[PDB]
Amino acid sequence: RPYDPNTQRRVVRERLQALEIINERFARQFRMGLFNLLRRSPDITVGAIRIQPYHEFARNLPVPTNLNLIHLKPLRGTGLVVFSPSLVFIAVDNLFGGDGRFPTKVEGREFTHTEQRVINRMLKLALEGYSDAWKAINPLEVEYVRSEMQVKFTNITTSPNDIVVNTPFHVEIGNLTGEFNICLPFSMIEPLRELLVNPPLENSRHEDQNWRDNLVRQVQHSELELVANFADIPLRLSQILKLKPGDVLPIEKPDRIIAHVDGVPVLTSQYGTVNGQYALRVEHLIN
Amino acid sequence: RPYDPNTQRRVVRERLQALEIINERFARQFRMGLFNLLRRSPDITVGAIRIQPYHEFARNLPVPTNLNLIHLKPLRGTGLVVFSPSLVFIAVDNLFGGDGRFPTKVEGREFTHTEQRVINRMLKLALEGYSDAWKAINPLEVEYVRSEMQVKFTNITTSPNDIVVNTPFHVEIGNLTGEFNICLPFSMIEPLRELLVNPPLENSRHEDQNWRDNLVRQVQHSELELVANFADIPLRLSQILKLKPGDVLPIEKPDRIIAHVDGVPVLTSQYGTVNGQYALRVEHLIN
Amino acid sequence: DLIMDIPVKLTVELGRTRMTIKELLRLTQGSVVALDGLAGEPLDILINGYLIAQGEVVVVADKYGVRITDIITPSERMRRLSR
Amino acid sequence: DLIMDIPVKLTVELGRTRMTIKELLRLTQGSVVALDGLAGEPLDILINGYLIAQGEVVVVADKYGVRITDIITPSERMRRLSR
Amino acid sequence: QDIDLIMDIPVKLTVELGRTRMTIKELLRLTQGSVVALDGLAGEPLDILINGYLIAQGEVVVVADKYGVRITDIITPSERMRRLS
Amino acid sequence: QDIDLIMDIPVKLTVELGRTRMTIKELLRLTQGSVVALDGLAGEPLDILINGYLIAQGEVVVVADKYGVRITDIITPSERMRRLS
Amino acid sequence: LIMDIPVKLTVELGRTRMTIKELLRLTQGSVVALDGLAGEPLDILINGYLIAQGEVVVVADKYGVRITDIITPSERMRR
Amino acid sequence: QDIDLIMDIPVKLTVELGRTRMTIKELLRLTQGSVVALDGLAGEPLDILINGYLIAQGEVVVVADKYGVRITDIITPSERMRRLS
Amino acid sequence: LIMDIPVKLTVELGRTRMTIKELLRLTQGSVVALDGLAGEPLDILINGYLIAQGEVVVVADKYGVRITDIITPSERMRR
């Protein structure tokens, strides 16, 4: 298995359960909105969050389909929500009156203006659900930018090998079924990677003081190892192999020695002798 | 392989990915504008950026064709955008109503006034896309100058062997296909050669102080080799061959010695002896 | 022995002490702490965090140096690490 | 030896030191730095960046000169460059 | 006297699932196939300590096939000496 | 005390793809056909250094068939001593 | 006597020679070319001392070095 | 101290198409049929000097079947010591 | 003893004898003729001392000198 710059991956194996729960909550807002709109009860199965290069995602995306760009302040970049012909078909059929027992294929014809308007109607609802799911974890301002036909026309990422995240959703209304995806570049969530790795927390006021107090009150007394390096000399394997008792290895004048824990300097001191012991007259702790 | 002044080439092997991305963005503005104008969805394939002498480009240019001159402040010179009979034909056919299933050859007839007018309408859109693609990287003021028939009538470069850059574009609308090129003398981009070699950067404010602080805080401490030249004597291979221990080689009076890294002087000093060591009493560092 | 020439970082340690957060927090200018090592007891020789031998500081003609006393002594090493 | 007559730039070096950007930044008028070379140790003879031999500065009748001691000594050169 | 001037100080934390109390004769008989129970009730919070000192209580979950403690409460002196005794 | 009076001063910068920790017995057995892994996770930023000291973190790309580092962040003291330990 | 001591080693892929000005000009997204050719055997360095040469391979989702050449100081002075 | 009181003073300029770096062993083998390359990139500006001292950079053309340099830039200290090293 | 020492050498294509007023008059695009004839064998000079003569060829997209004549100091005093 060779190494290539084409694999420009910040490969992820964490659970991303914060992303999972926020996707579930967004699907929840979308379900309530879609029940309100189409007068029918749907079910959204949130598929497994997928991590794949942009080229692979574009190839897997069924052409033709509808794509739409979102700008998410304060994060720089763009989101790539993709709506399938199947879901726009089901939505328009249910809105205009039908049973869906007579599906029609997609022949490459561009979507009608009415179909685009229905797409916008469901798109603003999806964006509002996206935003109100986000602001629980982190306040994000999401706004629609423009619509696109082909995936190669979205220029979502600088490189086709750029790593991206895809959240799929399977929306079913009765026997009617469809799918739609939400695509975000991994650079969108690089700054908040740790936030999305850890699960969201509900308490926001009590903890802020109870732990800042209790943690110091209890870590007040807990023993930790420390080692002070009095000297520092460089040698060689030759001198180490020939190292025999009775020789002297030169050392410069140590004006100050460093006491450290597991290597990290914690304080500086001057060595000395007190009550028959190797004592340290400290000067200050490194900040 | 001999050397000739006729090969007056500043031959380029760099990626010029800044030029590639700016060409892609210009093609993007052109695509959106052409969709707005001709009421049809085109696709522009940006061909490989070509580096060739002006005579070779002129020979490769299919005569007859339309050429147009641009002045790009503050850069001195001219751009040489060339529009093909194929694209002007497709544009006029789509504007005036047609399918393109009945193409007509070019018989050397000069373009009609209507055809030149359609050319101007596509040309101003192309120039605006050119400008708004440029000002992301460097603000360029591009303005149409005049139109020309034959390539030998453009006098774009002083010499036919002058090295030039060509950006080709293949524009397809349905089954209809055509091509057009944008030609720039390499002298136009001499000053910004490094700017076009390195990729464009998005951040423009935070970095401007973050890294000013951070690089000095961190390169605050990093070791570097330095050697001081105490003396300087010239010799010959004869004296080097006859050089045997026990001789003296004369040296003038060194009033000041130079301490340098890898050759480049970094400071001047006076030699001396301190605590049993060869010490340097520095005077100043060369600026 | 094709790896004959490799630089290695030597270090010495005086001693350690049971020493906690609040009492190190209380440390200020002139504060004194003690270590396990006895006065005149040989300091410990390590490299990159592993014991090698023991040695004491010696002042000869005003220059400091370290004079070693023992060897790695694997049985003694076993005894030391069994702590 | 058809290349007998070719001028070559000789140079000497006193010593080097572990010295960073801020320490040289702190250097001002009268500042002093040290080198690895011992007092009275022979300076190093190089030409265009390659060691040739070693030599010491000698003052005879008030005129300075360099008296060499060693030869290129390829084994010693191997030992030196293996550092 | 400073508050957080020791901003970076690495400490070692551990977690305990129960404690027991018996003599050497009950452990000399412990070999392969010998199991011993703990007084810790099945489901009570794991005891989070640092450097072998009591810190908190909290249960244990699995994250990406790895143990991870979800703390619930900090130890007060009232139950600290209860744990001591 | 000056700010940029050393305007020209050539330095040597290097980049590290991971660090390891083992003894001589694990390298004396290293010959042709012997491979060794590094603790560096496959995909973490390359460690940019200058003159053999820590500078930045950033990934590696290829430019005109040549290695080239795209830096992302500097090292701050917090993770500096983390790298040290 | 020296049976076991862990050693600190790195693997190096670039040695650009450059002054501080195009460090000062560096920002984020800034790409500097490094003299190491893509595919040239990567050199193995232990505690500041070069030992081996050999390219890079990924094993079990981990970085690793596939070594080919080792020491022979005849190729040391020119580097 | 005068500005242009040396109005007439003939000097010798030269131009260099590249510089190389090798030992005597690589030139003793240089005879008829032996060719040597230069580090100078094919197309970079010729180095204009006077009296063996760096002046400027500029390419070379032919005028009336004769070499002639077209200068483009005069050397600044920043690249002067870069050329030195 | 002197087996290996890298040397500094250049190749020269012009020796215009000319004073400073028509250096002062020089600007961008200024072309000065040089006595070297186009195609005349180019002289090889090593650290300020002429050795060889021979024209210029490009090899592997690199500058190079195709040498023909070498030393014979009989052609030195007139130059």
Coordinates of N, CA, C and O in Angstrom, one line a residue, chain G residues 6 8 12 14 20 25 29-31 33-34 37 39-40 45-46 48 51 59 68-69 71 77:
Chain G
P6 N 15.5 2.8 24.1 CA 14.7 3.4 23.1 C 15.5 4.6 22.5 O 16.1 5.4 23.2
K8 N 15.2 7.9 19.5 CA 14.3 8.9 18.9 C 14.7 9.1 17.4 O 15.9 9.5 17.2
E12 N 12.5 12.1 6.9 CA 12.6 13.5 6.4 C 12.3 13.5 4.9 O 12.8 12.6 4.2
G14 N 12.2 16.7 3.0 CA 12.6 18.0 2.4 C 13.7 18.8 3.0 O 13.8 18.8 4.3
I20 N 14.9 34.0 5.4 CA 13.6 34.1 6.2 C 12.5 34.9 5.5 O 11.4 34.9 6.0
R25 N 6.8 35.8 4.3 CA 5.7 35.8 3.3 C 4.7 34.6 3.4 O 3.7 34.7 2.8
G29 N -2.4 28.0 3.4 CA -2.5 27.6 2.0 C -1.2 27.9 1.2 O -1.1 27.4 0.1
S30 N -0.2 28.5 1.8 CA 1.0 28.8 1.2 C 1.8 27.5 1.0 O 2.0 26.7 1.9
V31 N 2.2 27.2 -0.3 CA 2.9 26.0 -0.6 C 4.3 26.4 -1.0 O 4.5 27.2 -2.0
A33 N 7.9 24.6 -2.4 CA 8.5 23.4 -2.9 C 9.7 23.0 -2.1 O 10.4 23.8 -1.6
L34 N 9.8 21.6 -2.1 CA 11.0 21.0 -1.3 C 11.7 20.1 -2.3 O 11.1 19.5 -3.1
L37 N 12.4 14.8 -4.4 CA 11.6 14.4 -5.6 C 10.5 13.3 -5.1 O 10.8 12.5 -4.3
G39 N 8.8 10.2 -4.9 CA 9.2 8.9 -5.2 C 10.6 8.6 -4.9 O 11.0 7.4 -4.9
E40 N 11.5 9.7 -4.7 CA 12.8 9.5 -4.3 C 12.9 8.8 -2.9 O 12.1 9.1 -2.1
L45 N 16.5 9.0 9.7 CA 17.4 9.7 10.6 C 17.1 9.4 12.0 O 15.9 9.5 12.4
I46 N 18.1 9.1 12.8 CA 17.9 8.7 14.2 C 18.7 9.7 15.0 O 20.0 9.8 14.9
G48 N 19.1 12.9 15.1 CA 20.0 13.8 14.4 C 21.1 13.3 13.6 O 21.9 14.0 13.1
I51 N 20.9 7.4 8.9 CA 21.3 6.0 8.8 C 20.9 5.4 7.5 O 21.7 4.9 6.8
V59 N 0.7 1.1 6.2 CA 0.4 -0.3 6.6 C -0.6 -0.2 7.8 O -0.3 0.5 8.8
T68 N 15.5 0.8 1.7 CA 16.3 0.1 0.7 C 17.8 0.1 0.9 O 18.4 -0.9 0.9
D69 N 18.3 1.3 1.2 CA 19.8 1.5 1.4 C 20.1 1.9 2.8 O 19.2 2.6 3.5
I71 N 23.4 3.3 5.5 CA 24.7 3.9 5.7 C 25.6 3.9 4.5 O 25.3 4.5 3.4
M77 N 29.5 12.6 2.7 CA 30.2 13.9 2.6 C 29.5 14.8 1.6 O 29.4 16.1 1.8

